[PDB]
Amino acid sequence: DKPLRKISAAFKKLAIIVNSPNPEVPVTQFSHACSLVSPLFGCLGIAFKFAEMAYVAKVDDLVRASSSISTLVVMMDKDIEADCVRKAGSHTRNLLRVKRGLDMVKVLFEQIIASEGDNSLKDPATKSYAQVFAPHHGWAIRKAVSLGMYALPTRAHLLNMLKEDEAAAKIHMQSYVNSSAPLITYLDNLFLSKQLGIDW
Ligand SMILES: CCCCCCCCCCCCC/C=C/[C@@H](O)[C@H](COP(=O)(O)O)NC(C)=O
């Protein structure tokens, strides 16, 4: 089906889990949902090429992890026990970056919705990247991203690539925004509650 619909369906499900008492988020289900977001970065063009190493490789690792590890909590606790939380390539470091990817797409969608009537994606792309990723990327990446903003598809072109009209895309984006918000909060709080921080 259409990429935004796959996304909204999968995250609705995740929202139910996190909004319930004693949530257990399976690594399989979380990593599959996160993989549905990947095609979005590609639709945005060269500006978001960083997403392959920054997001896709990370989801790939969680996909791998999911065969032997039950939940995100158990996954994090294993890395804590092994004292390898901030190590390059740890599941937990990867989870934190995946969280940022989910957040950037959330903010992007919010801004696209807020700017209905402007056929340019420049502000929404620039704003969300600035809010979510800019504080963690080095100079060269930030400069490259900014330059790549001239290569964004128009708003109408993007809708066409995602195979939706304005009304339908609005609903599915809003749905992801509503679903992903408590998930992102859930994830932040796992890090915060285990005294790991979220700014590294
Ligand atoms: C012919 C020219 C082709 C143009 C180049 C295409 C875009 C290149 C953008 C590459 C972005 C690389 C980002 C690297 C990802 C991670 O390995 C690295 C470290 O991963 P980490 O955040 O520590 O887990 N992340 C950062 C932002 O330093």
UniProtKB/Swiss-Prot annotation:
Residues annotated for an N-acylsphingoid base 1-phosphate binding in this entry: 54, 58, 93, 97, 137
Keyword Cytoplasm (UniProt): yes
Keyword Signal: no
Subcellular location: Cytoplasm
Gene inactivation effect: Constitutive expression of defense-related genes that accompany the hypersensitive response normally triggered by avirulent pathogens. Induction of growth inhibition, premature leaf chlorosis and defense-related programmed cell death (PCD) at the early seedling stage, leading to a lethal phenotype before flowering. Large increase of cell death inducer phytoceramide.
Lineage: superkingdom: Eukaryota
One annotated GO molecular function: lipid binding
Record-level GO BP terms: cell death; defense response to bacterium; response to salicylic acid
Residue ranges of the TM segments: none
A Gene Ontology cellular-component term: cytoplasm
InterPro entries: GLTP_sf, Glycolipid_transfer_prot_dom
Pfam families in the record: GLTP
Alphabetized UniProt keyword annotations: Cytoplasm, Lipid transport, Lipid-binding, Transport
Note: The clustered Lys-58/Arg-93/Arg-97 residues form a positively charged triad ideally arranged for binding phosphate, explaining the inability to bind sugar headgroups and transfer glycoproteins.
Protein family: Belongs to the GLTP family.
Functional note: Exhibits selective intermembrane transfer of ceramide-1-phosphate (C1P) and phytoceramide-1-phosphate. Does not transport ceramide (Cer) or GalCer, suggesting a requirement for phosphate in the headgroup for functionality. Transports in vitro sphingosine, but not glycosphingolipids. Also has some in vitro activity with sphingomyelin, a lipid not detected in plant tissues. The transport function may be not directly involved in regulating cell death.
Subunit details: Interacts with BPA1, PRA1F2 and PRA1F3.
Protein name stated in the entry: Accelerated cell death 11
Record organism: Arabidopsis thaliana (Mouse-ear cress)
